[model samples]
Target: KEAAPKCNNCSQRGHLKKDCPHIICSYCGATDDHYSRHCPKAIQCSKCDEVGHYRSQCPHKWKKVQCTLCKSKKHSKERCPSIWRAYILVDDNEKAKPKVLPFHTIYCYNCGGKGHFGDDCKEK
Candidate 1:
């Protein structure tokens, strides 16, 4: 016996949400009658409140854990240090602060390896 579940949109026990014509949208609500994402009333983001992008891809909401090198918030090649570092460097920033940086080059600088760092790496 194949069963039919209730419609979450209109709270009807007889049909699924896809079968409901007079649907209740989560975005603009039942007055417009469309799904949350396509409910084109303003298309506002829940976090940043931007009208262009959706809530799932909010820009300001993701800035909490941005890139490590230059500290930009996206996972793109534009913010990587190995791709093209800025005009600021000589050697380690010693005495300034005991900080941690990522590894790169042919190997890692920590163990003089082409793919390993000295501080935290297992033996190969």
Candidate 2:
């Protein structure tokens, strides 16, 4: 049998466009493949774990991107592990008052939406 007609320009297994190229393009910065032209230049969509789309528009509902700061695979910067990064400023200011209140924030991966840490959480 003859080989399937892959879009050599985009390297996709299906259709192609005139302006397409072998190099990948982040189509409209959308990074999803629900639509044709809006499809990214990638063959596999990380979000859907399927081909012909990008992660942003993946049909899968719970797709998540890795955090840039901690390199964790669960959440983004808003949920990074180094939350205390801002507190370093407290040490720089000698005149700053000591923090008396028990400041708390959730590390989604660690807390899992419950009032506890991952090691302490039973939701796993």
Candidate 3:
């Protein structure tokens, strides 16, 4: 005798539950579409507003963390300490008049590189 067709729900070779016209899925008991990531109901993260990605790489929003040393919002704490020390030394010698401060010696706060400040920051 020929074997009966297997049911999509129970996987038994007899009948398919989907063809029963009950309007309910016999396998997963869900009437909606597939619940996998490929499903249309898949949600996107608000932070990144992207699919299959998290908020850390979100391009639409921005986060600002304060620097512990100088507390300037411009840069991060990693470079703030050295920049703070350099500025403090200049402040202490305010009374001394130098022949001329070399343009190259000016610390570029933008790149944290010597000889250039934000106005002339080449990195930008």
Candidate 4:
């Protein structure tokens, strides 16, 4: 079986422009038929909050980090396991509950492994 023709203009599959009758801009939703390269709407990045490209294609060097516990960028929640482990503690008095200690005093902020920080993380 022969492979189906794909449109180079719109990057859509199953039809070439010679046989394709549709005229639409998939990127900026413009009335005139054109590719994304000619789009008038400015592309924005959600990650770095910049222009010219989306978050996935952002070229900005500074990337924001998120904490799993409180969703803050200040620190890594994984490094302090006591926060999550505290919830599992059973105590009659809420204030009297014993504080949970972290398994490791020092660990990797990236992969949550021992002996390194996020800057020296080997996982990346």
Cα-based lDDT at residue 72, candidate 3: 30
Taking the tens digit of each residue's C-alpha lDDT, what string does model 3 give over 52-117?
Answer: 454443334435546444443477645465654334434453456668776544566554455644
**Per-residue alpha-carbon lDDT of candidate 4 for residues 1-124, written as tens digits (9 for 90 to 100):** 1325455465554335553465553223223433557543333233332244445456545445454445434554455445643354365565555898767645665555556555655565
User: What's the lDDT for residue 64 in model 3?
Assistant: 55
TM-score of every prediction relative to native: 0.22, 0.17, 0.18, 0.18
Off by over 4 Å in 2: 1-63, 66-73, 81-90, 96-124
lDDT of 2 by residue, 1-124 (tens): 1225344465643334432443334332222342466554445454333454444546445444654455424755455546654334344635566778765666656553435555656565
Whole-model lDDT values for every prediction: 0.47, 0.45, 0.43, 0.46
Task: Return model 2's CA RMSD, one decimal.
Answer: 28.2
Task: Please give the range of 10 consecutive residues that has the lowest summed lDDT in model 4.
Answer: 41-50
List, residue by residue over 15-83, the lDDT tens digit for candidate 1. Answer: 345545655433332333346565554334443333555554554444433345556455654544454
Question: Candidate 1, which ten residues in sequence have the lowest lDDT sum?
Answer: 25-34
Query: What overall lDDT, based on C-alpha atoms, would model 2 receive against the true structure?
Result: 0.45
lDDT of 3: 0.43
How many clashing pairs in candidate 4? 0
- Model 3, residue 19: C-alpha shift (Å): 20
Q: In model 3, which regions exceed 4 Å deviation? A: 1-42, 47-60, 64-79, 84-86, 89-124
lDDT pick, better of 2 and 4: 4
| Model 1 misplacement above 4 A | 1-21, 26-30, 33-37, 40-60, 63-71, 75-79, 82-124
